[PDB]
Amino acid sequence: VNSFSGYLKLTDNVYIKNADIVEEAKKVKPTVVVNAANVYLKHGGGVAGALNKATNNAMQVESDDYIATNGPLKVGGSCVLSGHNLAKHCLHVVGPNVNKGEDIQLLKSAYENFNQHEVLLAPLLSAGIFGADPIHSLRVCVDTVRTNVYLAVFDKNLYDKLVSSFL
Ligand SMILES: O=C(O)C[C@H](NC(=O)c1ncnc2[nH]ccc12)c1ccccc1Cl
């Protein structure tokens, strides 16, 4: 039993809610919140900009040190950093950004990172300003992640569309 509330059950292990992931994180303090990162960990907009703002830019400061030491992530890759005031850990996951011309095929690899964590609070990877088809991303999610994932979808119309079209 865990402390996620008001989530609609999609599958054995995937639940979904129309909610602001920052507010969910501040409420639940999950072990892991997922960030929809880019390879440089430059947290400008979308999930990343929103999470980082909620940490008072501490996420960005930590991320800049990570990149200075380790170099960029791979598209499809991830790293574990602090969750600051939002969670114990933040799993920064790089899905493909279709608006950068990146290979949507790498979305499955991106979701595989979730399997290294028993429970996660997460956004829908590559959705929104990452420009992928969100129905497709939800399918790849449910068909790839085997651990317990709680998805927070910001946009109400998007949430309604995702629920109504889910197979
Ligand atoms: O779930 C959505 O609608 C799409 C989602 N965006 C957010 O979660 C989000 N965006 C902007 N400001 C925000 N403030 C609090 C949450 C938040 C998203 C997921 C992956 C990649 C990019 C994007 Cl854009």
Q: Kindly give the number of the ligand 1 atom that is closest to the alpha carbon of 21.
A: 16
The CA-to-CA distance between both ends of the chain, in Å, stands at 26
Residue 119 in contact with residue 125, Cβ under 8 Å? Answer: no
According to the entry, how was the structure determined?
Answer: X-ray
List 16's β-bridge partners, or say none.
Answer: 8, 151
What CATH number is associated with residue 107?
3.40.220.10
At 139, is the secondary structure helix, strand, or coil?
helix
List 92's β-bridge partners, or say none.
Answer: 35, 79
Q: Is residue 1 part of a domain?
A: no
Enter the resolution in angstroms.
1.0
At 46, is the secondary structure helix, strand, or coil?
helix
Q: Is residue 3 part of a domain?
A: no
User: Ligand 1 mean position to 76 CA, how many Å?
Assistant: 18
Q: Is residue 127 part of a domain?
A: yes
At 58, is the secondary structure helix, strand, or coil?
helix
| Block residue for tokens 């440089």 | 40
Domain count, the chain: 1
φ, ψ for residue 108 (rounded to 5)? -60, -45
At 48, is the secondary structure helix, strand, or coil?
helix
Sheet holding 32-36, edge to edge: 8-9, 14-18, 148-153, 119-122, 32-36, 89-93, 78-82
Q: Whose CA is nearest to atom 11 of ligand 1?
A: 46
Tokens (6 digits) for 10: 């999609």
CA–CA gap between residue 63 and residue 42 (Å, rounded): 8
Residues with CB under 6 A from ligand 1: 20-22, 36, 46-47, 50, 123-124, 127-130, 153-155, 158
